[PDB]
Amino acid sequence: YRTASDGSLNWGFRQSFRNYIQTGVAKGSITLGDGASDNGGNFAFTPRTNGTTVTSDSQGTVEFNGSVHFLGHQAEDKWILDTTMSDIKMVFNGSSAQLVVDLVAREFKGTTYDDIGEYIISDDIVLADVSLNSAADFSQDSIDLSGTTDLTAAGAQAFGGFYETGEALDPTGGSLTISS
Numbered sequence: 001y002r003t004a005s006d007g008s009l010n011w012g013f014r015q016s017f018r019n020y021i022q023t024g025v026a027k028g029s030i031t032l033g034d035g036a037s038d039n040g041g042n043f044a045f046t047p048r049t050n051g052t053t054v055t056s057d058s059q060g061t062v063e064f065n066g067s068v069h070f071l072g073h074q075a076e077d078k079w080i081l082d083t084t085m086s087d088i089k090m091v092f093n094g095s096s097a098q099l100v101v102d103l104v105a106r107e108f109k110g111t112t113y114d115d116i117g118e119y120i121i122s123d124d125i126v127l128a129d130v131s132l133n134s135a136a137d138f139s140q141d142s143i144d145l146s147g148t149t150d151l152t153a154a155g156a157q158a159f160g161g162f163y164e165t166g167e168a169l170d171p172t173g174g175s176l177t178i179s180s
């Protein structure tokens, strides 16, 4: 039995999006919950107790504590951009990983304040593919989470279609310690 007992995934999705929300035309806010930390905009998520499943030295899943709530485009008393990301998971396959999230997000209806989307629940969405700097090996004492990230087709759609499929996101960072 091996489990991720310490460390953090450090990832703020995409700096241009955080800037878009906080200082750009969205004029909104970012709020972290459930244990996530800011860590300079490279949001830090801790591994969840019992959150590690290992199927092979190079394959497994680590579930993380934390959530991110994006708000933008305040129209009347509603926010037209209202996206919550939770249940963050990292699924490892050697030098590759996937970043999986649950999303609760208003549908994008167009670039007007004359219309607002209803909340769409998107569970278990693969948001990004990760190219890890080093191969994940759950038989070792640590896993380096550093790597580059590509947005998936479904992630692009979940974020209003403004990004193209395969677009680069923030690189992943951090590390986990694995023990018995």
Ligand code: HEM
Pocket (backbone or CB within 6 Å): 014, 016, 017, 020, 024, 025, 073, 080, 081, 082, 106, 107, 108, 109, 110, 111, 112, 113, 117, 158, 159, 160, 162, 163
């Ligand atoms: C659910 C609703 C919405 C979502 C998910 C969404 C998402 C996004 C995303 C991901 C970007 C790219 C930001 C970046 O990284 O550069 C963007 C940019 C932009 N969006 Fe939104 N958006 C929404 C609603 C709206 C609305 C209602 C408007 C206008 C009425 C709008 C106008 C814009 C503009 C002008 C940009 C370009 C900003 C820039 O380049 O400075 N969006 N949006």
